[PDB]
């Protein structure tokens, strides 16, 4: 029943996706069924921080959020890792809704949980070929079908990270497969380890413009948002922000 | 019945507000009832480009959009200037909807038009004391009341530009006055004339972080998005992008 927690920080801003810029708290869980080659939070699954895992109850996480956040937040983003691996997260999501706190979720869309229907901002991020991951579309279909059946279409978005042209073609395939779902494109980060912020920012902004220029002429990507990682532009690869 | 046009460009991305990152075309009109001290598009009203005004029909604007944009767009953003000054814009907004094109609008919220109800993404931007403008709240109440009566609440947002603490207090007043409306905070641009992009980007990112740090501890700004100007981070103060 305990929840494996690695990070609890905030208040900060959501740097990605459907609710980008939103002031929110963060709860990063441990464990991933994926092993993406460019995972910017590899410590959640690579075993390098397994000893740092704190198994907490829903009340303990909420108390710690209220502690470091005070009354200066009404939004909480649950990430990882793949939080969808944890069924016991239901007690925490319910506790948030019972305290007038809106919840967001970051998942790659492999495992479905019934507490998905309680998420106000559900971001599903299928992984492109550059992540060396293989996408199970049957599992992705089941998740999106279940969400649409519970009228959660206003709370669900698709976000694909792009590193090259191959990823962009993969993103088009996903977008065409699910026409009604709000679609997002995200700039891929090359160096998730570098400490030189100035070079990183200039590099990512260059990648952003190159992506924008490419999508601009693609007629199959008209209903698409193109966004970077704002928190990376502000603090680089720093954790806890 | 002619529409005063100064800019027609795209496809690019929406760099601000509720639909930030969205691939869209731009139609910037002429004329403003405001004279904000930090207007990043002063040429639309300061009279410096009055000779460049092209009075076009709805069909001519649409034909030019289809010309430079092709079939690589499904979204059009109408800005200025204050487009709400133009009643004859109705024919153009209708023409967009009749051609499966979603329309967005940028206005400061002074003048109301009946074609507001046809806008898919209506951004209202009340001006803070730093703009040297005085906000008529009675006019702002009428606009927001009319929109809520036609169930356009899903299509309307409030966005306040912040330059200092005084603007931030003004933003809180606006947010408190309209609790149900999605609220946005935007980083103010100091130098809208500078040509040194690298210094401008580093300066605006610093202003962004300072704004985020300030909002993070404010309990009255929980349901708030904090965003910069993405197009300024990509192309600086360049026009036509
Ligand atoms: N302020 C703030 N602080 C954070 O810590 C924070 N974290 C996240 C977050 O972890 O979301 C997960 C998404 O990140 C993607 N992702 C992984 N690796 C990536 C990479 N190398 N390049 C580009 N994208 C990558 C992944 O697809 C997933 O959808 C989001 N917003 C945040 N905002
Ligand atoms: N790609 C792309 N190209 C554009 O040309 C473009 N234009 C606009 C746009 O004009 O929106 C108007 C908003 O801009 C605000 N605004 C004025 N002056 C400002 C300033 N000095 N600093 C900070 N904000 C300012 C104003 O409040 C208004 O709400 C929006 N997105 C765009 N995206
Ligand atoms: C570091 S990614 C965390 C969320 C989830 N694993 C995803 O990829 O969407
Ligand atoms: C250059 S701003 C253009 C849109 C409108 N005048 C506003 O301030 O919101
Ligand atoms: S699914 Fe997300 S957390 Fe897991 S390895 Fe991929 S990017 Fe990292
Ligand atoms: S209302 Fe908008 S266009 Fe008019 S002066 Fe102010 S910022 Fe410029």
UniProtKB/Swiss-Prot annotation, chains A, B:
Pathway: Purine metabolism; 7-cyano-7-deazaguanine biosynthesis. GO terms for molecular function: 4 iron, 4 sulfur cluster binding; carbon-nitrogen lyase activity; magnesium ion binding; protein homodimerization activity; S-adenosyl-L-methionine binding. S-adenosyl-L-methionine binds at residues 81, 125-127. Its cofactor is [4Fe-4S] cluster; S-adenosyl-L-methionine; Mg(2+). Binds 1 [4Fe-4S] cluster. The cluster is coordinated with 3 cysteines and an exchangeable S-adenosyl-L-methionine. It catalyses: 6-carboxy-5,6,7,8-tetrahydropterin + H(+) = 7-carboxy-7-deazaguanine + NH4(+). Residues 19-237 form the Radical SAM core domain. GO terms for biological process: queuosine biosynthetic process. Substrate binds at residues 13-15, 28, 79. Keywords: 4Fe-4S, Iron, Iron-sulfur, Lyase, Magnesium, Metal-binding, Queuosine biosynthesis, S-adenosyl-L-methionine. Homodimer. HAMAP family: QueE. This is 7-carboxy-7-deazaguanine synthase. It comes from Bacillus subtilis (strain 168). The lineage of its organism: Bacteria, Bacillati, Bacillota, Bacilli, Bacillales.
């Amino acid at each position: 029943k305990g929840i494996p927690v690695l990070e609890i920080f905030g208040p900060t801003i959501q740097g990605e996706g459907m609710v980008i810029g939103q002031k929110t708290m963060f709860v990063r869980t441990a464990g991933c069924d994926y092993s993406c080659s460019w995972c910017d939070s590899a410590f959640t699954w690579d075993g390098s921080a397994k000893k740092d895992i704190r198994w907490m109850t829903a009340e303990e996480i909420f108390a710690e959020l209220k502690d470091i956040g005070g009354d200066a937040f009404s939004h909480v983003t649950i990430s990882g890792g793949n939080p969808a691996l944890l069924k016991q997260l239901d007690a925490f999501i319910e506790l948030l809704k019972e305290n007038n706190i809106r919840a967001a979720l970051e998942t790659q869309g492999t495992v479905y949980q019934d507490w998905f229907t309680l998420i106000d901002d559900l971001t599903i991020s299928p992984k492109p070929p550059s992540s060396k991951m293989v996408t199970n579309f049957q599992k992705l279909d089941h998740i999106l079908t279940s969400l649409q059946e519970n009228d959660r279409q206003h709370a669900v978005s698709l976000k694909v990270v792009i590193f090259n042209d191959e990823d962009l073609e993969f993103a088009k395939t996903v977008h065409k497969r699910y026409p009604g779902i709000p679609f997002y494109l995200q700039v891929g980060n090359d160096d998730v380890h570098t400490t030189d912020d100035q070079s990183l920012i200039a590099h990512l902004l260059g990648k952003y413009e190159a992506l924008v220029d490419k999508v601009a002429v693609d007629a199959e990507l008209n209903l698409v948002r193109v966004l970077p990682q704002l928190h990376t532009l502000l603090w680089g690869n720093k954790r806890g922000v």
